[PDB]
mmCIF file of C-alpha atoms in Angstrom:
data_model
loop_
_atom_site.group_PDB
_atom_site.id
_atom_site.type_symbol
_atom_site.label_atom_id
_atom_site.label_comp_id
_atom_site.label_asym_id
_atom_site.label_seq_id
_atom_site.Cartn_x
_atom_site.Cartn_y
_atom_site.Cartn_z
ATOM 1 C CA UNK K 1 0.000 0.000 0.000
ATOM 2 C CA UNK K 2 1.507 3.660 -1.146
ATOM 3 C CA UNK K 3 0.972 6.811 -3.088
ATOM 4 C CA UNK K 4 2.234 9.651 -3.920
ATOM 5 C CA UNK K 5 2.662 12.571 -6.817
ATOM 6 C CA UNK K 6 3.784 11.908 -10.236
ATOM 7 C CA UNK K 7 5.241 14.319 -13.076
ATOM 8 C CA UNK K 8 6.616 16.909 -10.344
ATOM 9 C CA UNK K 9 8.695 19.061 -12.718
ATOM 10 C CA UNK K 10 11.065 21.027 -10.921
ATOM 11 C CA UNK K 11 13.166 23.902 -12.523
ATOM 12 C CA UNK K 12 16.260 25.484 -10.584
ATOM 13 C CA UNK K 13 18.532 28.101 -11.756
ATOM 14 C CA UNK K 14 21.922 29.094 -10.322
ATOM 15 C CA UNK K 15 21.913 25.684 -8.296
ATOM 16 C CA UNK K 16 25.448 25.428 -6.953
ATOM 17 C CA UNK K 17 27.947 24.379 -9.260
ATOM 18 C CA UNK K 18 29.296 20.791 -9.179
ATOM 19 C CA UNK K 19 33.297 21.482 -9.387
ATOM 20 C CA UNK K 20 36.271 19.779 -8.310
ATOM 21 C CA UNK K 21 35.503 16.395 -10.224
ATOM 22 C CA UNK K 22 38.419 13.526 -10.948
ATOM 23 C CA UNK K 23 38.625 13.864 -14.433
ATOM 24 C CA UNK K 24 39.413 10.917 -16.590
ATOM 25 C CA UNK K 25 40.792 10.039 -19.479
ATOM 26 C CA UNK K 26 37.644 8.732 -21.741
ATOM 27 C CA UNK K 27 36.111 11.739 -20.604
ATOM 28 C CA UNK K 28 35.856 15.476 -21.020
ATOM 29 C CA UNK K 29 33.557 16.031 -18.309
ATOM 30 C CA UNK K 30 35.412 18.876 -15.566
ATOM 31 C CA UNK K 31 32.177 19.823 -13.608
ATOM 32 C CA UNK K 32 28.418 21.457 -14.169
ATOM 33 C CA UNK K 33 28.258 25.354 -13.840
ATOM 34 C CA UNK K 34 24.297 24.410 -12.887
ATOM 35 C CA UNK K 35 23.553 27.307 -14.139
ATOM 36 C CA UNK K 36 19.934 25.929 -15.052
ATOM 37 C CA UNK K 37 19.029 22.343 -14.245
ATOM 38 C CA UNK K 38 15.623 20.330 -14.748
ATOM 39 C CA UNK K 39 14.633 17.209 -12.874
ATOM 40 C CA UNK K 40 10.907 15.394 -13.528
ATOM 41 C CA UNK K 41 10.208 14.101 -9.102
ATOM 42 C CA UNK K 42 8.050 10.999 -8.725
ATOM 43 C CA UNK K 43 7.315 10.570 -4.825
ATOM 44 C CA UNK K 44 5.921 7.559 -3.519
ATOM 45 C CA UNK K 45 5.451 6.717 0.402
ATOM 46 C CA UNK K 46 3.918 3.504 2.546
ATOM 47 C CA UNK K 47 -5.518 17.033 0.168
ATOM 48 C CA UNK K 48 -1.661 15.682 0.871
ATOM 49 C CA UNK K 49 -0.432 14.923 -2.539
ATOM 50 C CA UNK K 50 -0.293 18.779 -3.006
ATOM 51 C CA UNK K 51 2.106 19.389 0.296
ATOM 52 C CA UNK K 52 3.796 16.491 -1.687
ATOM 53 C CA UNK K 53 4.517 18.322 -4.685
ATOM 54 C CA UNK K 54 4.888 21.353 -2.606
ATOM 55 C CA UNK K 55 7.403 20.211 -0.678
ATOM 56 C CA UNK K 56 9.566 18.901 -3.086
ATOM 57 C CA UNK K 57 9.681 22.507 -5.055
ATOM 58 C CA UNK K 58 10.560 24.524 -2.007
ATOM 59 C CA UNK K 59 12.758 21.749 -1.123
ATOM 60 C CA UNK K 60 14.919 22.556 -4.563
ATOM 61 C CA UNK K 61 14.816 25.636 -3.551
ATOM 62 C CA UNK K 62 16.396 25.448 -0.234
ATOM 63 C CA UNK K 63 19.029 22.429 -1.260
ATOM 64 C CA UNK K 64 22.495 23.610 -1.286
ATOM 65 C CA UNK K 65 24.481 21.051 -2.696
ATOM 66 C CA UNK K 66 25.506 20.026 -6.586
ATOM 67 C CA UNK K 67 23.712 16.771 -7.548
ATOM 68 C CA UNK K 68 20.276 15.261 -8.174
ATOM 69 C CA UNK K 69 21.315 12.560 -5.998
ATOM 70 C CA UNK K 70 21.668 14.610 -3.452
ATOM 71 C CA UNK K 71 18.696 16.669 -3.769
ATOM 72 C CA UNK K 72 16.710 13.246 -3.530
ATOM 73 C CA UNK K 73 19.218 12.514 -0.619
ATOM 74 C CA UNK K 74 17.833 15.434 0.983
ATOM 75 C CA UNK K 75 13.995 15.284 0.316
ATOM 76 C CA UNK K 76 13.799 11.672 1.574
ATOM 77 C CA UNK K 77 15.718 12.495 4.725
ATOM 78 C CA UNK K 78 13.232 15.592 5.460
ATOM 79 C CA UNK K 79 10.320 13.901 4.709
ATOM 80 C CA UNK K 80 10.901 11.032 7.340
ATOM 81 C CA UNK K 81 11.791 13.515 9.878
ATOM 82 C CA UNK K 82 8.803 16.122 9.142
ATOM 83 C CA UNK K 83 6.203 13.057 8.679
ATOM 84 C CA UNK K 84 5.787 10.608 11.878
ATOM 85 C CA UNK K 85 3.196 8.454 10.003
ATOM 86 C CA UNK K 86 5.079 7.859 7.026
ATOM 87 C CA UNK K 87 7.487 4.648 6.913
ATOM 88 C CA UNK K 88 8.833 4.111 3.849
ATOM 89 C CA UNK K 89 9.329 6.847 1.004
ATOM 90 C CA UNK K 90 10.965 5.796 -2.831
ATOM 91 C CA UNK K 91 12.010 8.719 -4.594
ATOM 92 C CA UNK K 92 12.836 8.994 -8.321
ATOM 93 C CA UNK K 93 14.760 12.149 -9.877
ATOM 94 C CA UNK K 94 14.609 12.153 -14.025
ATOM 95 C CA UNK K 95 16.972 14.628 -15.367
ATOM 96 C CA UNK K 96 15.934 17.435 -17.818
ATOM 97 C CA UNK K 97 19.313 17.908 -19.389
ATOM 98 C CA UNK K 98 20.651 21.339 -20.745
ATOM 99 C CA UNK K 99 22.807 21.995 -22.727
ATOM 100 C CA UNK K 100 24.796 25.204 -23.347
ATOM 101 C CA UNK K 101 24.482 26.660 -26.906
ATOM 102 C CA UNK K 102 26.894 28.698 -28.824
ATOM 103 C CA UNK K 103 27.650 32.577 -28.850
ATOM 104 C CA UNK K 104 29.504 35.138 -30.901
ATOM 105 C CA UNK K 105 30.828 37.592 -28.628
ATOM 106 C CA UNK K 106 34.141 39.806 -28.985
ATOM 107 C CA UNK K 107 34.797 38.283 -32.580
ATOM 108 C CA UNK K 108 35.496 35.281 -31.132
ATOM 109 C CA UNK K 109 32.655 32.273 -31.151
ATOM 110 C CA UNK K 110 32.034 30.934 -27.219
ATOM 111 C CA UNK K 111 30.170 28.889 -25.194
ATOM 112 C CA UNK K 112 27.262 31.077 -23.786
ATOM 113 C CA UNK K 113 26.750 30.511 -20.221
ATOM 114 C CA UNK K 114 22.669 32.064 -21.052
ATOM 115 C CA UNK K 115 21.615 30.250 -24.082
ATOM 116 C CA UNK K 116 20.441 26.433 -23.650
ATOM 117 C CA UNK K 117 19.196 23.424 -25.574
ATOM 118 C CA UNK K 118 16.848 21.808 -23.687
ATOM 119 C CA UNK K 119 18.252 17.741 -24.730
ATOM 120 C CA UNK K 120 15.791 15.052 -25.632
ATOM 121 C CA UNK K 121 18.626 12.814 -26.181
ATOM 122 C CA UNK K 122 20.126 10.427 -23.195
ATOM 123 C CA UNK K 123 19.175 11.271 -19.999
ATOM 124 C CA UNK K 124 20.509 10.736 -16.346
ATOM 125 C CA UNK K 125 17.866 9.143 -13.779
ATOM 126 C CA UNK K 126 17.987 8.425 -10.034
ATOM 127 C CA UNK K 127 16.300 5.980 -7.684
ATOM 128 C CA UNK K 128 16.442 6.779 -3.750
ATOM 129 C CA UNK K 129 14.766 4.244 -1.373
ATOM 130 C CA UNK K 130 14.617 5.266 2.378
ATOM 131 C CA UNK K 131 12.819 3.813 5.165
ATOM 132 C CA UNK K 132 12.247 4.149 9.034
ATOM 133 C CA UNK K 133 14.498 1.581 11.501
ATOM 134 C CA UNK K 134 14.170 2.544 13.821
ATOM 135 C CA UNK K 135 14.931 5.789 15.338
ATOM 136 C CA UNK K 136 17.509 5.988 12.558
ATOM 137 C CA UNK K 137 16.829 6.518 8.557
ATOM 138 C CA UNK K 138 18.124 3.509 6.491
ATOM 139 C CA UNK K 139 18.854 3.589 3.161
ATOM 140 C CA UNK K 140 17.163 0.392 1.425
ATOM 141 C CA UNK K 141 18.194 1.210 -2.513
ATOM 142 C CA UNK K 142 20.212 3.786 -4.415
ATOM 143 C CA UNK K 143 20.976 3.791 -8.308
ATOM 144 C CA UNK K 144 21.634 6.334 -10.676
ATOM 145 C CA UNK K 145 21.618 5.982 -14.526
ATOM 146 C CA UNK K 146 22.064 6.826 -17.857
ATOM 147 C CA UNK K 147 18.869 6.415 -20.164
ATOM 148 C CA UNK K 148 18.270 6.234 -23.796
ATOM 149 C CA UNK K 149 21.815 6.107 -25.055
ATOM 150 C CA UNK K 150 20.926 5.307 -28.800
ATOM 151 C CA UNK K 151 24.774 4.241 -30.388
ATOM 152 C CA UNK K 152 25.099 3.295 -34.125
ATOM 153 C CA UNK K 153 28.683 1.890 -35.266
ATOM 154 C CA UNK K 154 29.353 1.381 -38.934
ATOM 155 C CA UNK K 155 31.774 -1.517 -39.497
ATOM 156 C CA UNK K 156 34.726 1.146 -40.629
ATOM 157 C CA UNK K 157 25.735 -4.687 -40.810
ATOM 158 C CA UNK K 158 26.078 -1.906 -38.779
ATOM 159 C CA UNK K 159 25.193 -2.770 -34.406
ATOM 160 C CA UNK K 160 22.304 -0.033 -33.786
ATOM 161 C CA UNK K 161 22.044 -0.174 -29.875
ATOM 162 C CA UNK K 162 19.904 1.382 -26.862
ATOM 163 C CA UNK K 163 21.591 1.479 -23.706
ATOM 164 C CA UNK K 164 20.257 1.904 -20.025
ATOM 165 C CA UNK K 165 23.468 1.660 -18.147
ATOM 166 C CA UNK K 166 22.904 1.932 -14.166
ATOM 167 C CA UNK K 167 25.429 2.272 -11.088
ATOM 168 C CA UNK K 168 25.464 1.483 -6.959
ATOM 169 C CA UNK K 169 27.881 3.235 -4.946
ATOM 170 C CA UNK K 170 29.176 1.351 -2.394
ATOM 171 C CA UNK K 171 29.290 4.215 0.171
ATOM 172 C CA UNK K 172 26.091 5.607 -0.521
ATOM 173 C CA UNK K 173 27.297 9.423 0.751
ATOM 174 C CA UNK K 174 29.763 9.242 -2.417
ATOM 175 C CA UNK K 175 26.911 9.623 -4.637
ATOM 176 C CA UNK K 176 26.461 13.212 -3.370
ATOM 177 C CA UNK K 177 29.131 14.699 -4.648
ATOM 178 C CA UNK K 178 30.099 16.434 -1.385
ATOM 179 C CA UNK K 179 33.598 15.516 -2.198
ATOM 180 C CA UNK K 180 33.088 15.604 -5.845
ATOM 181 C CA UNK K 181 36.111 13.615 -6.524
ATOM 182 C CA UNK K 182 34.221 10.416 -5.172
ATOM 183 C CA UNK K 183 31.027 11.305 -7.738
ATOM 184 C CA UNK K 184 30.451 9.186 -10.954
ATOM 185 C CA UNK K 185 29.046 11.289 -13.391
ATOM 186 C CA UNK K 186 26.505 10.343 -16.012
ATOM 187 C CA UNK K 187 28.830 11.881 -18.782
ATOM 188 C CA UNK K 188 31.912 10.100 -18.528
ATOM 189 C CA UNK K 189 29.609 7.024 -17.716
ATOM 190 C CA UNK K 190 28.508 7.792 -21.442
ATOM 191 C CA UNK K 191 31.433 8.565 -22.714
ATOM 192 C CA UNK K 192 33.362 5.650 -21.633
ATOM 193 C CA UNK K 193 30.310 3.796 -23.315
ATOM 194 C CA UNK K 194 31.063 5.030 -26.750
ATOM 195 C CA UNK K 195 35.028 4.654 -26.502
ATOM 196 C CA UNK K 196 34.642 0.855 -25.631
ATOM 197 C CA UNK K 197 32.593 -0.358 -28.645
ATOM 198 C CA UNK K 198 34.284 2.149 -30.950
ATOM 199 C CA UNK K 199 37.628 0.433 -30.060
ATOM 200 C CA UNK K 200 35.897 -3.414 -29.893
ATOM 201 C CA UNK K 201 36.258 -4.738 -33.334
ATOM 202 C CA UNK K 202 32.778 -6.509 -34.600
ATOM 203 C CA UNK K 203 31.564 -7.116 -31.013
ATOM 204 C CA UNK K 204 28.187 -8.663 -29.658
ATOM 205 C CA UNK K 205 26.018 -6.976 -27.471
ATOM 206 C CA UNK K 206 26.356 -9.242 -24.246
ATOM 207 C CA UNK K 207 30.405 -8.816 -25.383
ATOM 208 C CA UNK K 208 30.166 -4.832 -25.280
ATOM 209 C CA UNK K 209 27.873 -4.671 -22.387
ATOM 210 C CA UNK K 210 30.337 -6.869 -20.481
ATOM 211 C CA UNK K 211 33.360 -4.592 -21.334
ATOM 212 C CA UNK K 212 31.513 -0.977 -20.703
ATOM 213 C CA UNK K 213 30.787 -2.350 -17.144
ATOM 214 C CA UNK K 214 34.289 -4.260 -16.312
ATOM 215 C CA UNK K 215 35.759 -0.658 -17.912
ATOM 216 C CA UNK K 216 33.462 1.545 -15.416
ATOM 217 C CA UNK K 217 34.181 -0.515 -12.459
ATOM 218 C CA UNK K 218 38.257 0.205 -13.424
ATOM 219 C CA UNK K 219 38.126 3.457 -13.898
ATOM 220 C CA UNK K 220 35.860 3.966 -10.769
ATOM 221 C CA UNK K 221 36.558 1.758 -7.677
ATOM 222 C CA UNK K 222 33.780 3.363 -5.850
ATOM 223 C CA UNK K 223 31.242 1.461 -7.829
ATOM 224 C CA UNK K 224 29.971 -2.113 -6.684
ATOM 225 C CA UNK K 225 28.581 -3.049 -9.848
ATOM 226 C CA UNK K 226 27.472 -2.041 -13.206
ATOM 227 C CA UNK K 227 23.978 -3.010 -14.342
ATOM 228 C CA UNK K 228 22.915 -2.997 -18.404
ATOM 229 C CA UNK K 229 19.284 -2.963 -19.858
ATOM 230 C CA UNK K 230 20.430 -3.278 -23.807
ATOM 231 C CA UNK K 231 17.876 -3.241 -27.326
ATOM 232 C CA UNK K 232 18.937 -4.360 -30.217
ATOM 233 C CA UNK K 233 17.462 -1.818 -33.196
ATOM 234 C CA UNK K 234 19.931 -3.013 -35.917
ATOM 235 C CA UNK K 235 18.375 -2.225 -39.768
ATOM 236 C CA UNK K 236 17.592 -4.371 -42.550
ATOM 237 C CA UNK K 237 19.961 -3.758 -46.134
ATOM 238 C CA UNK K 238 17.887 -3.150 -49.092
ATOM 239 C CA UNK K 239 20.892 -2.405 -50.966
ATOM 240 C CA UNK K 240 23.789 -4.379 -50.357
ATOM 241 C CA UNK K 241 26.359 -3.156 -53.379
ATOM 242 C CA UNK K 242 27.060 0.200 -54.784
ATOM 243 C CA UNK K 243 29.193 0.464 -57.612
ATOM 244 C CA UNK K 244 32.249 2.982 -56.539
ATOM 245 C CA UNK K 245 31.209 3.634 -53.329
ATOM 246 C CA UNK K 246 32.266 1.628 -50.049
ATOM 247 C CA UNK K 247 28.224 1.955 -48.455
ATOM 248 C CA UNK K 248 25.151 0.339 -48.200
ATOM 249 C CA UNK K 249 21.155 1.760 -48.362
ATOM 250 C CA UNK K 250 19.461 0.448 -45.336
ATOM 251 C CA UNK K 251 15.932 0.886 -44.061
ATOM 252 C CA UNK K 252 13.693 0.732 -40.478
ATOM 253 C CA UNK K 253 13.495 -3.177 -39.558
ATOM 254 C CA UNK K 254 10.093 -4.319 -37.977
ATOM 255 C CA UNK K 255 9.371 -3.609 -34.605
ATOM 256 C CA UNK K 256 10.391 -6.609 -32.580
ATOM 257 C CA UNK K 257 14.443 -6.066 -31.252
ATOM 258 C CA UNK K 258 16.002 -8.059 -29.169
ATOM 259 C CA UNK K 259 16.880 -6.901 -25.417
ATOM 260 C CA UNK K 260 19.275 -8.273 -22.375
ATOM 261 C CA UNK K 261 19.802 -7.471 -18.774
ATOM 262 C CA UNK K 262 23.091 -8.235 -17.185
ATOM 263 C CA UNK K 263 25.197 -6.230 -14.049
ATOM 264 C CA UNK K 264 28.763 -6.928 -13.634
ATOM 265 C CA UNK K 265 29.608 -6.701 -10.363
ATOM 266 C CA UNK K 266 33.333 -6.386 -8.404
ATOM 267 C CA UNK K 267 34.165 -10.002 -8.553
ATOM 268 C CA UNK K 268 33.706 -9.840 -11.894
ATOM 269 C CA UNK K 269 36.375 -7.374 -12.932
#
Protein backbone atom coordinates (compact mmCIF):
# COMPACT_ATOMS: atom_id res chain seq x y z
CA UNK A 1 0.00 0.00 0.00
CA UNK A 2 1.51 3.66 -1.15
CA UNK A 3 0.97 6.81 -3.09
CA UNK A 4 2.23 9.65 -3.92
CA UNK A 5 2.66 12.57 -6.82
CA UNK A 6 3.78 11.91 -10.24
CA UNK A 7 5.24 14.32 -13.08
CA UNK A 8 6.62 16.91 -10.34
CA UNK A 9 8.69 19.06 -12.72
CA UNK A 10 11.06 21.03 -10.92
CA UNK A 11 13.17 23.90 -12.52
CA UNK A 12 16.26 25.48 -10.58
CA UNK A 13 18.53 28.10 -11.76
CA UNK A 14 21.92 29.09 -10.32
CA UNK A 15 21.91 25.68 -8.30
CA UNK A 16 25.45 25.43 -6.95
CA UNK A 17 27.95 24.38 -9.26
CA UNK A 18 29.30 20.79 -9.18
CA UNK A 19 33.30 21.48 -9.39
CA UNK A 20 36.27 19.78 -8.31
CA UNK A 21 35.50 16.39 -10.22
CA UNK A 22 38.42 13.53 -10.95
CA UNK A 23 38.62 13.86 -14.43
CA UNK A 24 39.41 10.92 -16.59
CA UNK A 25 40.79 10.04 -19.48
CA UNK A 26 37.64 8.73 -21.74
CA UNK A 27 36.11 11.74 -20.60
CA UNK A 28 35.86 15.48 -21.02
CA UNK A 29 33.56 16.03 -18.31
CA UNK A 30 35.41 18.88 -15.57
CA UNK A 31 32.18 19.82 -13.61
CA UNK A 32 28.42 21.46 -14.17
CA UNK A 33 28.26 25.35 -13.84
CA UNK A 34 24.30 24.41 -12.89
CA UNK A 35 23.55 27.31 -14.14
CA UNK A 36 19.93 25.93 -15.05
CA UNK A 37 19.03 22.34 -14.25
CA UNK A 38 15.62 20.33 -14.75
CA UNK A 39 14.63 17.21 -12.87
CA UNK A 40 10.91 15.39 -13.53
CA UNK A 41 10.21 14.10 -9.10
CA UNK A 42 8.05 11.00 -8.73
CA UNK A 43 7.32 10.57 -4.82
CA UNK A 44 5.92 7.56 -3.52
CA UNK A 45 5.45 6.72 0.40
CA UNK A 46 3.92 3.50 2.55
CA UNK A 47 -5.52 17.03 0.17
CA UNK A 48 -1.66 15.68 0.87
CA UNK A 49 -0.43 14.92 -2.54
CA UNK A 50 -0.29 18.78 -3.01
CA UNK A 51 2.11 19.39 0.30
CA UNK A 52 3.80 16.49 -1.69
CA UNK A 53 4.52 18.32 -4.69
CA UNK A 54 4.89 21.35 -2.61
CA UNK A 55 7.40 20.21 -0.68
CA UNK A 56 9.57 18.90 -3.09
CA UNK A 57 9.68 22.51 -5.05
CA UNK A 58 10.56 24.52 -2.01
CA UNK A 59 12.76 21.75 -1.12
CA UNK A 60 14.92 22.56 -4.56
CA UNK A 61 14.82 25.64 -3.55
CA UNK A 62 16.40 25.45 -0.23
CA UNK A 63 19.03 22.43 -1.26
CA UNK A 64 22.49 23.61 -1.29
CA UNK A 65 24.48 21.05 -2.70
CA UNK A 66 25.51 20.03 -6.59
CA UNK A 67 23.71 16.77 -7.55
CA UNK A 68 20.28 15.26 -8.17
CA UNK A 69 21.32 12.56 -6.00
CA UNK A 70 21.67 14.61 -3.45
CA UNK A 71 18.70 16.67 -3.77
CA UNK A 72 16.71 13.25 -3.53
CA UNK A 73 19.22 12.51 -0.62
CA UNK A 74 17.83 15.43 0.98
CA UNK A 75 14.00 15.28 0.32
CA UNK A 76 13.80 11.67 1.57
CA UNK A 77 15.72 12.50 4.73
CA UNK A 78 13.23 15.59 5.46
CA UNK A 79 10.32 13.90 4.71
CA UNK A 80 10.90 11.03 7.34
CA UNK A 81 11.79 13.51 9.88
CA UNK A 82 8.80 16.12 9.14
CA UNK A 83 6.20 13.06 8.68
CA UNK A 84 5.79 10.61 11.88
CA UNK A 85 3.20 8.45 10.00
CA UNK A 86 5.08 7.86 7.03
CA UNK A 87 7.49 4.65 6.91
CA UNK A 88 8.83 4.11 3.85
CA UNK A 89 9.33 6.85 1.00
CA UNK A 90 10.97 5.80 -2.83
CA UNK A 91 12.01 8.72 -4.59
CA UNK A 92 12.84 8.99 -8.32
CA UNK A 93 14.76 12.15 -9.88
CA UNK A 94 14.61 12.15 -14.02
CA UNK A 95 16.97 14.63 -15.37
CA UNK A 96 15.93 17.43 -17.82
CA UNK A 97 19.31 17.91 -19.39
CA UNK A 98 20.65 21.34 -20.75
CA UNK A 99 22.81 22.00 -22.73
CA UNK A 100 24.80 25.20 -23.35
CA UNK A 101 24.48 26.66 -26.91
CA UNK A 102 26.89 28.70 -28.82
CA UNK A 103 27.65 32.58 -28.85
CA UNK A 104 29.50 35.14 -30.90
CA UNK A 105 30.83 37.59 -28.63
CA UNK A 106 34.14 39.81 -28.98
CA UNK A 107 34.80 38.28 -32.58
CA UNK A 108 35.50 35.28 -31.13
CA UNK A 109 32.66 32.27 -31.15
CA UNK A 110 32.03 30.93 -27.22
CA UNK A 111 30.17 28.89 -25.19
CA UNK A 112 27.26 31.08 -23.79
CA UNK A 113 26.75 30.51 -20.22
CA UNK A 114 22.67 32.06 -21.05
CA UNK A 115 21.62 30.25 -24.08
CA UNK A 116 20.44 26.43 -23.65
CA UNK A 117 19.20 23.42 -25.57
CA UNK A 118 16.85 21.81 -23.69
CA UNK A 119 18.25 17.74 -24.73
CA UNK A 120 15.79 15.05 -25.63
CA UNK A 121 18.63 12.81 -26.18
CA UNK A 122 20.13 10.43 -23.19
CA UNK A 123 19.18 11.27 -20.00
CA UNK A 124 20.51 10.74 -16.35
CA UNK A 125 17.87 9.14 -13.78
CA UNK A 126 17.99 8.43 -10.03
CA UNK A 127 16.30 5.98 -7.68
CA UNK A 128 16.44 6.78 -3.75
CA UNK A 129 14.77 4.24 -1.37
CA UNK A 130 14.62 5.27 2.38
CA UNK A 131 12.82 3.81 5.16
CA UNK A 132 12.25 4.15 9.03
CA UNK A 133 14.50 1.58 11.50
CA UNK A 134 14.17 2.54 13.82
CA UNK A 135 14.93 5.79 15.34
CA UNK A 136 17.51 5.99 12.56
CA UNK A 137 16.83 6.52 8.56
CA UNK A 138 18.12 3.51 6.49
CA UNK A 139 18.85 3.59 3.16
CA UNK A 140 17.16 0.39 1.42
CA UNK A 141 18.19 1.21 -2.51
CA UNK A 142 20.21 3.79 -4.42
CA UNK A 143 20.98 3.79 -8.31
CA UNK A 144 21.63 6.33 -10.68
CA UNK A 145 21.62 5.98 -14.53
CA UNK A 146 22.06 6.83 -17.86
CA UNK A 147 18.87 6.41 -20.16
CA UNK A 148 18.27 6.23 -23.80
CA UNK A 149 21.82 6.11 -25.05
CA UNK A 150 20.93 5.31 -28.80
CA UNK A 151 24.77 4.24 -30.39
CA UNK A 152 25.10 3.29 -34.13
CA UNK A 153 28.68 1.89 -35.27
CA UNK A 154 29.35 1.38 -38.93
CA UNK A 155 31.77 -1.52 -39.50
CA UNK A 156 34.73 1.15 -40.63
CA UNK A 157 25.73 -4.69 -40.81
CA UNK A 158 26.08 -1.91 -38.78
CA UNK A 159 25.19 -2.77 -34.41
CA UNK A 160 22.30 -0.03 -33.79
CA UNK A 161 22.04 -0.17 -29.88
CA UNK A 162 19.90 1.38 -26.86
CA UNK A 163 21.59 1.48 -23.71
CA UNK A 164 20.26 1.90 -20.03
CA UNK A 165 23.47 1.66 -18.15
CA UNK A 166 22.90 1.93 -14.17
CA UNK A 167 25.43 2.27 -11.09
CA UNK A 168 25.46 1.48 -6.96
CA UNK A 169 27.88 3.23 -4.95
CA UNK A 170 29.18 1.35 -2.39
CA UNK A 171 29.29 4.22 0.17
CA UNK A 172 26.09 5.61 -0.52
CA UNK A 173 27.30 9.42 0.75
CA UNK A 174 29.76 9.24 -2.42
CA UNK A 175 26.91 9.62 -4.64
CA UNK A 176 26.46 13.21 -3.37
CA UNK A 177 29.13 14.70 -4.65
CA UNK A 178 30.10 16.43 -1.38
CA UNK A 179 33.60 15.52 -2.20
CA UNK A 180 33.09 15.60 -5.85
CA UNK A 181 36.11 13.61 -6.52
CA UNK A 182 34.22 10.42 -5.17
CA UNK A 183 31.03 11.31 -7.74
CA UNK A 184 30.45 9.19 -10.95
CA UNK A 185 29.05 11.29 -13.39
CA UNK A 186 26.50 10.34 -16.01
CA UNK A 187 28.83 11.88 -18.78
CA UNK A 188 31.91 10.10 -18.53
CA UNK A 189 29.61 7.02 -17.72
CA UNK A 190 28.51 7.79 -21.44
CA UNK A 191 31.43 8.56 -22.71
CA UNK A 192 33.36 5.65 -21.63
CA UNK A 193 30.31 3.80 -23.31
CA UNK A 194 31.06 5.03 -26.75
CA UNK A 195 35.03 4.65 -26.50
CA UNK A 196 34.64 0.86 -25.63
CA UNK A 197 32.59 -0.36 -28.65
CA UNK A 198 34.28 2.15 -30.95
CA UNK A 199 37.63 0.43 -30.06
CA UNK A 200 35.90 -3.41 -29.89
CA UNK A 201 36.26 -4.74 -33.33
CA UNK A 202 32.78 -6.51 -34.60
CA UNK A 203 31.56 -7.12 -31.01
CA UNK A 204 28.19 -8.66 -29.66
CA UNK A 205 26.02 -6.98 -27.47
CA UNK A 206 26.36 -9.24 -24.25
CA UNK A 207 30.41 -8.82 -25.38
CA UNK A 208 30.17 -4.83 -25.28
CA UNK A 209 27.87 -4.67 -22.39
CA UNK A 210 30.34 -6.87 -20.48
CA UNK A 211 33.36 -4.59 -21.33
CA UNK A 212 31.51 -0.98 -20.70
CA UNK A 213 30.79 -2.35 -17.14
CA UNK A 214 34.29 -4.26 -16.31
CA UNK A 215 35.76 -0.66 -17.91
CA UNK A 216 33.46 1.55 -15.42
CA UNK A 217 34.18 -0.51 -12.46
CA UNK A 218 38.26 0.20 -13.42
CA UNK A 219 38.13 3.46 -13.90
CA UNK A 220 35.86 3.97 -10.77
CA UNK A 221 36.56 1.76 -7.68
CA UNK A 222 33.78 3.36 -5.85
CA UNK A 223 31.24 1.46 -7.83
CA UNK A 224 29.97 -2.11 -6.68
CA UNK A 225 28.58 -3.05 -9.85
CA UNK A 226 27.47 -2.04 -13.21
CA UNK A 227 23.98 -3.01 -14.34
CA UNK A 228 22.91 -3.00 -18.40
CA UNK A 229 19.28 -2.96 -19.86
CA UNK A 230 20.43 -3.28 -23.81
CA UNK A 231 17.88 -3.24 -27.33
CA UNK A 232 18.94 -4.36 -30.22
CA UNK A 233 17.46 -1.82 -33.20
CA UNK A 234 19.93 -3.01 -35.92
CA UNK A 235 18.38 -2.23 -39.77
CA UNK A 236 17.59 -4.37 -42.55
CA UNK A 237 19.96 -3.76 -46.13
CA UNK A 238 17.89 -3.15 -49.09
CA UNK A 239 20.89 -2.41 -50.97
CA UNK A 240 23.79 -4.38 -50.36
CA UNK A 241 26.36 -3.16 -53.38
CA UNK A 242 27.06 0.20 -54.78
CA UNK A 243 29.19 0.46 -57.61
CA UNK A 244 32.25 2.98 -56.54
CA UNK A 245 31.21 3.63 -53.33
CA UNK A 246 32.27 1.63 -50.05
CA UNK A 247 28.22 1.95 -48.45
CA UNK A 248 25.15 0.34 -48.20
CA UNK A 249 21.15 1.76 -48.36
CA UNK A 250 19.46 0.45 -45.34
CA UNK A 251 15.93 0.89 -44.06
CA UNK A 252 13.69 0.73 -40.48
CA UNK A 253 13.50 -3.18 -39.56
CA UNK A 254 10.09 -4.32 -37.98
CA UNK A 255 9.37 -3.61 -34.61
CA UNK A 256 10.39 -6.61 -32.58
CA UNK A 257 14.44 -6.07 -31.25
CA UNK A 258 16.00 -8.06 -29.17
CA UNK A 259 16.88 -6.90 -25.42
CA UNK A 260 19.28 -8.27 -22.38
CA UNK A 261 19.80 -7.47 -18.77
CA UNK A 262 23.09 -8.24 -17.19
CA UNK A 263 25.20 -6.23 -14.05
CA UNK A 264 28.76 -6.93 -13.63
CA UNK A 265 29.61 -6.70 -10.36
CA UNK A 266 33.33 -6.39 -8.40
CA UNK A 267 34.16 -10.00 -8.55
CA UNK A 268 33.71 -9.84 -11.89
CA UNK A 269 36.37 -7.37 -12.93
Amino acid sequence: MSYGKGNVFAYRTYLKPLTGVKQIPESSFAGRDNTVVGVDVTCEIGVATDSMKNFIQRHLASYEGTTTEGFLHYVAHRFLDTYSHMDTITLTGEDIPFEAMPAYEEKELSTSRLVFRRSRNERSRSVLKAERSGNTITITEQYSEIMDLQLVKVSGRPLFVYLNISWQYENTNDSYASDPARYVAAEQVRDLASTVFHELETPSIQNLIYHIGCRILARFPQLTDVSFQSQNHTWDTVVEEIPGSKGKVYTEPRPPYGFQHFTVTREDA
